[PDB]
Design a protein around this ligand. Structure first.
Ligand SMILES: *[C@@H]1O[C@H](CO)[C@@H](O)[C@H](O)[C@H]1NC(C)=O
Ligand SMILES: [Cu+2]
Length: 235
């Protein structure tokens, strides 16, 4: 159970984005139904009044929280991967539009899941803004908590992989469009019950054997990291 508070650009806090530049749902409950329109941008997908200006090559940092800003972030039980996607705003995230800019699942050196390192990072994870066409975009940050992912939601709706999905409205101003955005996957649609990484038993299967759901990260990406860029407590 986690939500996005706002974003940082190049290490500068853009301010509380909830219902402003983040298409925020009303609470931190997970999405579990892989076929639901809620997979696109969570349960209250609508245009919000602001879009954060960035340029290609900027660092865009999502900041997550549990109950209050810079708290425990997400329950430690919620081991799983983190991804970021991009699509043009004109899509409203419909169709074959979502391009993967970032993937982190399990780090064998530190023996940590992406989620574990997100807590250590005070909720902060980043992508580098790609050289796509200037214009309005949705950046879809996705945490998958696997603590009940031994079951499939489609079979047992009180269990399943848990998706914490947040869409940020981002406007790319300065970009040479040298890496124009390639075809995307649909959400809902890309993840199915047979997709690698959707059904997994983190209690019996070695984390080293985990494979995150496709698609692969776009070669055009520059992203990106799970790491604290700014200190929320200084504000
Ligand atoms: C899952 O989502 C689909 C598509 O909206 C819907 O038809 C189905 O009823 C949902 N399942 C549950 C258990 O709500
Ligand atoms: Cu939770």
């Amino acid at each position: 159970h986690t939500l996005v508070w706002g974003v940082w650009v190049n290490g500068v806090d853009q301010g509380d984005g909830r219902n402003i530049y983040i298409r925020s749902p009303p609470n931190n409950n997970p999405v579990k139904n892989l076929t639901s329109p809620d997979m696109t941008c969570n349960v209250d997908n609508r245009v919000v009044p602001k879009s954060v200006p960035v340029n290609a090559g900027d660092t865009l940092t999502f900041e997550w929280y549990h109950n209050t800003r810079d708290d425990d972030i997400i329950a430690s039980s919620h081991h799983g991967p983190i991804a970021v996607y991009i699509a043009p705003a004109a899509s409203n995230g419909q169709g074959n539009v979502w391009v993967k800019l970032f993937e982190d699942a399990y780090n064998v050196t530190n023996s940590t899941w992406a989620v574990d390192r997100l807590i250590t990072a005070h909720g902060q994870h980043s992508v580098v803004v790609p050289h796509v066409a200037p214009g309005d975009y949705l950046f879809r940050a996705e945490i998958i908590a696997l603590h009940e992912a031994d079951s499939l939601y489609s079979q047992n709706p009180i269990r399943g992989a848990q998706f914490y999905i947040s869409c940020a409205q981002i406007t790319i101003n300065s970009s040479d469009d040298s890496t124009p955005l390639p075809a995307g996957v649909p959400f809902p649609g890309a993840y199915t019950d047979s997709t690698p990484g959707i059904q997994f038993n983190i209690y019996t299967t070695p984390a080293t054997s985990y494979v995150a759901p496709p698609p692969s990260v776009w070669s055009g990406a520059l992203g990106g990291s799970i790491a604290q860029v700014g200190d929320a407590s200084l504000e």
